[PDB]
Amino acid sequence: DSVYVQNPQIPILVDRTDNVLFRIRIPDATKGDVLNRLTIRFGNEDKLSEVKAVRLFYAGTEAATKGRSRFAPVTYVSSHNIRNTRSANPSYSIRQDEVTTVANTLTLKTRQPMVKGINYFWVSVEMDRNTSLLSKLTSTVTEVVINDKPAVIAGEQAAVRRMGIGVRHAGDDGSASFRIPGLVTTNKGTLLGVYDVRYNNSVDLQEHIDVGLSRSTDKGQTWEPMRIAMSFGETDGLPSGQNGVGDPSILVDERTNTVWVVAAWTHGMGNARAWTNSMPGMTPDETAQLMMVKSTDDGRTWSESTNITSQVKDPSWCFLLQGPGRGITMRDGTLVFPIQFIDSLRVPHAGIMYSKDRGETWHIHQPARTNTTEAQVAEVEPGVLMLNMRDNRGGSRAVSITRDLGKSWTEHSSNRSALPESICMASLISVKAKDNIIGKDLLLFSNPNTTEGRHHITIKASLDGGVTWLPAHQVLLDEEDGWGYSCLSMIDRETVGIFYESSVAHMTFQAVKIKDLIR
Amino acid sequence: DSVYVQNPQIPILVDRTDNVLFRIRIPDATKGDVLNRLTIRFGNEDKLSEVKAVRLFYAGTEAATKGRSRFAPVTYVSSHNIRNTRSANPSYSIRQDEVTTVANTLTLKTRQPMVKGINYFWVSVEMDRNTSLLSKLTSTVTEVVINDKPAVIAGEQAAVRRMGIGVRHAGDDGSASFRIPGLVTTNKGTLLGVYDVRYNNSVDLQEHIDVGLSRSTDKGQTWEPMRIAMSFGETDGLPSGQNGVGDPSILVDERTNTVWVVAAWTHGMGNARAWTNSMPGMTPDETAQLMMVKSTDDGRTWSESTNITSQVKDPSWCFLLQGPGRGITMRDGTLVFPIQFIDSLRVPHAGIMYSKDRGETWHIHQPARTNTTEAQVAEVEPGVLMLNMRDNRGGSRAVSITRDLGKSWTEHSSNRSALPESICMASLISVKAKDNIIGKDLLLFSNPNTTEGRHHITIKASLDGGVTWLPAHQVLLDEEDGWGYSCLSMIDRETVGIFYESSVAHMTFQAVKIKDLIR
């Protein structure tokens, strides 16, 4: 007689067989009670054309000790099961009904007798594989009938659901996992997404890891098969498991359209984490190496790797590597990659590395802040670089300014205040007024918008050079748990792309109108 | 400088492509040093004709922080990787050499330049797939040559290596894992091994779990395809993930050769552990159910399950189930299964359940001991049952006697003293004097022979009804880490079979001459 409905703010993947539209908790069932039918309604303006099917599933009951406020006993659609990331695990969910032609009103039926107490049902939505990434569903459970009486419906279920595409799922092309996203838009409008290909498992370097790249010439609707942008196989006769390269950062040289990918090659180091096992020195046998590849053909083919360690690594550092995600071209044509180093006393520092000669030579000056790691840089105003930093103190992003490419650093007003975090990679980009439909300079930022865990992946916009991030100028994309790393790139004048580790896929692409951010 | 050699006491699987014969640590290498050649010698009476090939692998180096005493950076041959349990992970080991015709002396070569410090090599043995399970190798590294100088060899490498067979590997027939072994020998000499088929992962009930059975009519050399002995699929319209059955115990009714399998069916309980979520009551919706199948055709086909719960479960118990492993026929024809119950206050007790009518009706009297769980029972003398118990107090097995089928219990002299454990399932069987080649009553026991972790799987024999377990009357089978559950059954007059979770496979069978136990 009382039913609870959840409409979870998570991406509907156009390439998935099942996506969670509604979770339903019937908390106080009498044994034998039957959910005869439930009615969904879609909003007037919904493009029901590109909805392929809607399914009602039963998932049984809850454990006696797990309490009465959960919407599921288990993950319905796994983002980690290498054998199935695309459909509901059939061992957790039994299909009751299915409609393959969707109208604005829709009724699903069961004859399943319920157990005493908590019973779980959910609604799966399957989209046409060619569904527009910019499409939205406004769906409501309007009627639930139990023992031929309409039941009282409760819960927040007014979420506007967005589409996305699982560019990489766990198990794709034999790889256990994919991590550490980077995204740029080439001068030809081509989306380039980079990531770790983590073949054996999901652990950080050292392991068998290559740098993968997914390419889209249609604003993310389709992605060309995975290219290996960088790999070290059995270099020097050491196993591929002791020759990993990863934590990639990608940038487009906007003057030439030359694309650059920088990454950390770990050589040796047993089967342990490079973060604590990379040591002082310069040789591949001694310390992690800073490796770069380039594409001169819009990311279709990739150069052999060049070793730039000798140019920029201090011998006393335990570890120098890029900040994962992306770098930038500045207005004066300087290429800038965020970097991070562990000093002789094992203290991490964020900073920047830049080339003034199209990527021929690279320079690092002074660190921005102590006990920071992963950082992303934007040119917030001409000749003014904002470094936005993961901070081991917890709670909030560190923000510093350089006007001299990291020779000197100033604390920004927004430092350790404006942007909450849980100690996790975050994306920051600048959008020039002339390059977007708002006609105003923007900063766009994405991270897990929480001080604990990795969830509530959110795009935030600032109109005042990242002094203020108004709540209204934010879109929630993924309220469920994931590995939390993300990277932003403007797709065109009207839309921002996010390439991120989500609750629905290891590498998830979504496109968001900047008019949804700034209303 | 010196080199260190390990000959690990782990099973050589006749069905594996790779098995670790030797691990080698070269601790203090100069960059460029080359292990030119390595000589192994086999004992004069070794059956080298059933050795198919020997391989030398390089595995690179060690992590800076992991110290100097390890024999490997990583597991070389995985017992968990659903994509490969049978050959070395090629990302961790590079083959240097291979000999396919094995003599008493054997030389393996490399041209691999070593890194400064620690370098790992290992020797893989592949056996003929028809290799005798009773065969042994006595192998030693006699020469290691580096830079054309013989190096000083150190280490304990005098192990007599035994054969085994991986009856179930992780991933077999689509199942993530296999756990909880039981083994009997039918009156026809047929080996019947039962186990959890844990489809989704390796967690305990509640989950998608069936009872599997492997059958061998040739004393374990070959195993028939896996049969599902018990399964509840989508009973009552609940998902298979909320209809698991497992923790099996198997016995042969020696009077009739009727084989019986008892198991715990969990219905509902969300995706949580039944151990803490099974609750008082009697119905499948309320509490775990005690379910039984039988085979009248030597384990080829299995009856539909009968529900025994009403006969033996007190309503106030949170959980009644069998002790995993096996039950017995007593000399007077009584069938006995070890059982365990959680009382109304969540305190576990071990006991016995018996049938005097060929398995028609079952009875439980009094528990043996507070805060015990998994137990195995043997008829040490006519009408005298020894219950050997997992004890939550830690350190050692509890041992009690009943002469009245558990109405009353006496502490045995060996109680909480003679048999070390880490709080883990253990196997105990009795062998009558007339039924074995020693012509003496035996007790045989197997468990991880440690107070910490699960390793050193060992068969122990007692000649004095389990009063004493002399060190000499013990065989070490697996000194490396596993899940630790095991079950014993006499194969014939001369050999005991062990079906166990090992470091080399989820379900491992080995055969041991009792003349190796009692010398």
Residue numbers in the entry:
A (entry chain B), B (entry chain A): 34 to 552
Question: Which sentences did the original study use to describe this structure?
Answer:
The NanH sialidase of Tannerella forsythia, one of the bacteria associated with severe periodontal disease plays a role in virulence. The C-terminal catalytic domain is preceded by a 160 amino acid N-terminal domain that is a CBM that our laboratory discovered is capable of binding various sialoglycans and non-sialylated derivatives but has no catalytic activity itself. The NanH catalytic domain (residues 197–552) folds into a characteristic 6-bladed β-propeller catalytic domain, with each blade being composed of 3–4 antiparallel β-strands.
Using our established protocol for producing highly purified and concentrated enzyme, NanH was screened in sitting-drop crystallisation trials, with conditions containing protein in 0.1 M HEPES pH 6.0, 7% w/v PEG 6000 producing robust crystals. The model consisted of 519 residues (34–552) in each subunit and showed that there were two copies of NanH in the asymmetric unit. The location of the active site in NanH is highlighted by the presence of the conserved catalytic residues at the centre of the propeller, where D237 is the conserved aspartate, which is believed to be involved in the catalytic mechanism along with Y518 and E407, which are likely the nucleophile and acid–base residues, based on structural homology. Surprisingly, in our first crystal form, the active site was occupied by a molecule of HEPES (shown in yellow), with its sulfate group occupying the predicted position of the sialic acid carboxyl group expected from its location in other structures and being co-ordinated by R212, R423 and R487 that form an arginine triad. A lower concentration of HEPES in the crystallisation buffer of 0.01 M did result in subsequent datasets and maps to which a model was fitted that lacked the HEPES molecule but otherwise had identical features, implying that binding of HEPES did not cause changes in conformation. It is also notable that the NanH model shows a non-proline cis-peptide between residue L238 and Q239. In this region of the model adjacent to the cis-peptide in space, we also see an uncommon arginine rotamer (observed in other protein structures with ≤1% frequency) for R306. The data here reveal that the CBM is composed of 4 antiparallel β-strands that form the base of an open cleft.
